[PDB]
Symmetry: C2
Subunit: 123 residues, 2 copies
Amino acid sequence: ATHEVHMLNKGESGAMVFEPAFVRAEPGDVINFVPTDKSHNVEAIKEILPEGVESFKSKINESYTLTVTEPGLYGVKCTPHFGMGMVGLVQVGDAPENLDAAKTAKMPKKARERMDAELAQVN
Amino acid sequence: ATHEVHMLNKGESGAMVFEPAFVRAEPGDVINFVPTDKSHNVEAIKEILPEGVESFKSKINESYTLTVTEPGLYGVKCTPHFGMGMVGLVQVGDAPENLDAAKTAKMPKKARERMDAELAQVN
Ligand SMILES: [Cu+2]
Ligand SMILES: [Cu+2]
């Protein structure tokens, strides 16, 4: 299955956001990151990645297609707006093995506040 | 401004969901509840409504246009699927005066679990 996530300056939940910021996928699913607004990109938050998945970083203003194979939580951020809280979370499969990494990963306060909000949708 | 919320059987966060389940609006905003899938409706959760706003209930499979004037939290549910957790939350303005009603409103466990997840996006 395919999932679409928009990169927006202003979404339904706030400013500088991935929308939806939380996506529940299954192994083999495709996640398309679409820059609805310019100035955004998507990059993996290395601390929040399943074992065995390579880090990724797209170019600004470009679409990025992420194929999730490994189960676990995938944390993503927008490089220039990490500080302003532009983060997203993808949960592949049940009982994420790296739930505690996601819960304790050190990050800019706004991003940490949004990651926590997203973690509350887990399972 | 206008905000669109879809009623779905299966969304990006789970099954039987309002999507987005959390909308941040300003007084005078319009919220359109669109049944993307059939069998859903939107009805106000009376315990989670600002002072002075009338309760509302739309017919199944119908669109509903909610104009939010009063600031505060507006809780909505899908009548036939309340028990399965199909609830949504709208925050109009800052510092919702009825935040504690939303936090303690008695409701079916799944709905309560989802409401709490949505409350975490508040402010
Ligand atoms: Cu960005
Ligand atoms: Cu429903």
